[PDB]
Structure formats: structure tokens, C-alpha cells
Amino acid sequence: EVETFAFQAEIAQLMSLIINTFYSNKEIFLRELISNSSDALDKIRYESLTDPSKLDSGKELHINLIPNKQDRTLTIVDTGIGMTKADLINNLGTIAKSGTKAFMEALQAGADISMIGQFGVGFYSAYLVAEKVTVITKHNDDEQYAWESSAGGSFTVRTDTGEPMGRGTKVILHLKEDQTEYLEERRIKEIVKKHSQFIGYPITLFVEK
Ligand SMILES: CC1(C)Cc2cccc(C(N)=O)c2O1
């Protein structure tokens, strides 16, 4: 059973701008997703300071980057607080509706796409290089769910039946045909040491054989 939702108009215009605007510094998407993972890890570690039972679903707090050249996917796995069905559907979009409006005002005032993180909408920068984004998350107070959208103005949410995660968020980027450079081991290295060198959690790059 899969439910299909319609993106808010402001968010839908933000993504379509991201995919269609000719912008060459697309490497900033990894900095935002890693920063999003660092925020999720800061939350779950902060809640465990007054409730250590929240870490029963996992004590390790790390970020994993798993490129796959066969499936043409780049995966970012973090063990943060996770996301609920209300967060995936509403809530998070309500928070981002103001950051989107302010972002589109700043692009016309001189700012570029690289400043998308300063508005709290840095996740949508994933569509700079991905034609389809799948999100698998697990929150301590909800079931495992699957978020998916190929832009177009709509997204789907369903209960995940795959391998359980315990807690955290898995972001799977189905990369575009011309963005396969972000699956190379030395390209992901350059981006991490240049953009996410000061993250307070271990960022492990999974190499392929
Ligand atoms: C930018 C934001 C925090 C809002 C939002 C809504 C739905 C999914 C995500 C995400 N997958 O990071 C998301 O990240």
C-alpha cells in the first residue's frame, strides 16, 4: 500500500528550479546531505542525555557513504534520530515552506544555489545530481517508512518491508547519467575533505571491489 502526495507549490517550484537551472558546482549536494546527517545525529545524542533508552536501537553515531556503480546509486546512511510519517509527509515541509520563499528571494538578489543550506532546505539540493531520491528512515516512535520522489510535483510514502535499520535515515540517490563522477572513490574524497572536514561524527567511505 503506497500513498501518493502532492508537494507544496513553493517546494515544487524550488525543485524544478534545482533540476533545470544550469549550475556547474553540483558537488555541494554532498555537503548538505552530510550536514543534514550531522543534525540528525546531534538530535538523537542530545535526547539520550536525559534518556539513554533512546539509544537501545543503536549506540553508534556515524555517517556512511556507499557508492554503487552497478545500480548507479550514491547512498548516505546515518544513525541519527530518524524520521516519522508526519515528518515525511507534513511537518518538515511546513518548516521548509518559509526557507524556500526566502531562498528564491535570495537567488534574485545575487545569491546562488550553493547557499541553499543557509535556508534549511539543503536536502532538495540532492536533485542537482539525482533524477530520483529514495529515503528509508526509522524513528524510535514510528515504523520504518520509505520516501520516494522523481520530482514532478509529487512524492510517495509507504511502509518499508526491506532490511530493518533500527534507527536513522538512508538516502539513496539515483544519479543522473551525466553525474556518475560522484561514484568515484577519489571524487567523494575531495568533496568530503573540502566541504565536510569539520563534522563531529565519523564519515566512512565504503569503497567498492
Ligand atoms: C530539508 C528537510 C529537513 C525537509 C525534508 C522533508 C522530507 C525529507 C527530507 C529528507 N529526506 O532529508 C527533508 O529534509
State yes or no: 78 annotated in a binding site.
yes
- 169 near 140, Cβ under 8 Å? no
17 class by beta-carbon count within 10 Å (0-12 exposed, 13-18 middle, 19+ buried): middle
Output the residue whose Cα is nearest ligand 1's atom 5.
Answer: 92
Q: Using a 6 Å cutoff on CB, does residue 123 contact ligand 1?
A: yes
Output the residue whose Cα is nearest ligand 1's atom 9.
Answer: 123
**Three-state DSSP class for residue 130:** strand
Neighbours of 112 (CB within 10 A): 12
**Three-state DSSP class for residue 199:** coil
Output the residue whose Cα is nearest ligand 1's atom 7.
Answer: 88
The residue ranges of DSSP E strands in the chain, in sequence order, are 2-6, 63-68, 73-78, 130-138, 144-149, 154-159, 168-175, 203-205
Q: Nearest-CA neighbor of 55 among 63, 42, 44?
A: 44
> What is the spatial distance between Cα 22 and Cα 137, in angstroms, rounded to a whole number?
31
CATH classification code of 2-205: 3.30.565.10
Q: Using a 6 Å cutoff on CB, does residue 30 contact ligand 1?
A: no
What was the structure determination method? Answer: X-ray
Task: State how far the alpha carbon of 48 is from the alpha carbons of 2, 45, 102, 154, 166, in Å.
Answer: 33, 5, 34, 35, 15
Both ends of the chain: CA-CA distance in Å? Answer: 36
Q: Using a 6 Å cutoff on CB, does residue 7 contact ligand 1?
A: no
The residue ranges of DSSP E strands in 21-164, in sequence order, are 63-68, 73-78, 130-138, 144-149, 154-159
Residue-range domain boundaries for the chain: 2-205
Instruction: Count Cα neighbours of 3 within 13 Å in the Cβ-side half-sphere.
Output: 12
